[PDB]
Amino acid sequence: WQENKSWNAHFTEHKSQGVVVLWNENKQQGFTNNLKRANQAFLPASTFKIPNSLIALDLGVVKDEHQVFKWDGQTRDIATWNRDHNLITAMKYSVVPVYQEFARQIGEARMSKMLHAFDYGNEDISGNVDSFWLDGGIRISATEQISFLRKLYHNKLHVSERSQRIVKQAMLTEANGDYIIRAKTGYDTKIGWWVGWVELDDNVWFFAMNMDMPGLRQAITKEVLKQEKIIP
């Protein structure tokens, strides 16, 4: 990993601190504006949707991306959560309750196995089954995020290719003639993430960022990518 202090500017211009980690799959090389922080491990928070949804799919808890999760009737503070959802929209709108119901049905036992299998962060499950990625003991870093996402990208995680395909579909956020982005913001604690990747014709660029959260995040990450000519 090559350190690039230049990028701090993009955090500074909005009076914030964070780390951005890029990985050029072809050149097989990392970059980041803060090497240490890029290995500081934090609560995955909203980024946990990915492993969570892979596991759910692999254990048949979730059949497919069309299966509907009926809304329980409880009116929560975010309007979008108060309707039925499938895997796609749940991801699009970061619907926490859906992901808690997953975790419950997975159970503490199977969940622990799978995280050890993914080599996910410190693979720690302490906390409530349905909260630990927000509350509990699990931790992961931006670099550790990248290693995970690469596996996912290459179908080389220890779950079915099918499970890996469907989650990659659900991550779809933006696509136009120039690029495709698979990445989903979600509601995060003091440290907020954006992680995913950009598919180009000729290459794929993985990214994981996080910042101290005192709305930009996607915005900052994208200023760094335009700088590196990864997108216009």
Add this chain to the structure above:
Amino acid sequence: WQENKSWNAHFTEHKSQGVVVLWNENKQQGFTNNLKRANQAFLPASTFKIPNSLIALDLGVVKDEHQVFKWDGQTRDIATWNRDHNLITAMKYSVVPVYQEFARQIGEARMSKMLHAFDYGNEDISGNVDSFWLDGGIRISATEQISFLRKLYHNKLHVSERSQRIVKQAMLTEANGDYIIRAKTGYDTKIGWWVGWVELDDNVWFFAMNMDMPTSGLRQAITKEVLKQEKIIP
């Protein structure tokens, strides 16, 4: 299957003739600006990339979306074709040669079986193995396109789910917070199509259009003016 004449305007505004066919998956209902033409069957031309690539994937001719097809060295008139490609970029740039090499390796025999299995149009293969969807016998209509795409969408075709998933990935053309479109323009010698669908949060809308080609930025622009009209997209 409501006919809606009002949409002809969008063709007329650019001095062209065509048909647009919509299908609302939820409401399970069609729409179109010319009912007759919506059943006029034509050469699939570029739209054949879909069944072609499904079959290739199912028969293991194509392993996956990363497999590289090396450029044969012949310099063709479209610059993008003169490089190596994978399934994704081949679709994105409508690289005819790649799809011809598929058809050859599939062979006339297996190809015929599969088209019968897809219930694809007339299921007619006459012509050259590597050209027939451009040159010869096969025909399909806009409505027949929609029935096919719906199967594909629902993994209801007679091939592996996997094959169907990968092709659906490759079709990805545009996506933002409001919608996702899976559809690919390509070069059509006589008649120009745009066929695919729009995924919304709550619903999916299938479309198949075609139009008479001017003496050569048209097909997608029209189709989208119809979709904005129906409030399917902004």
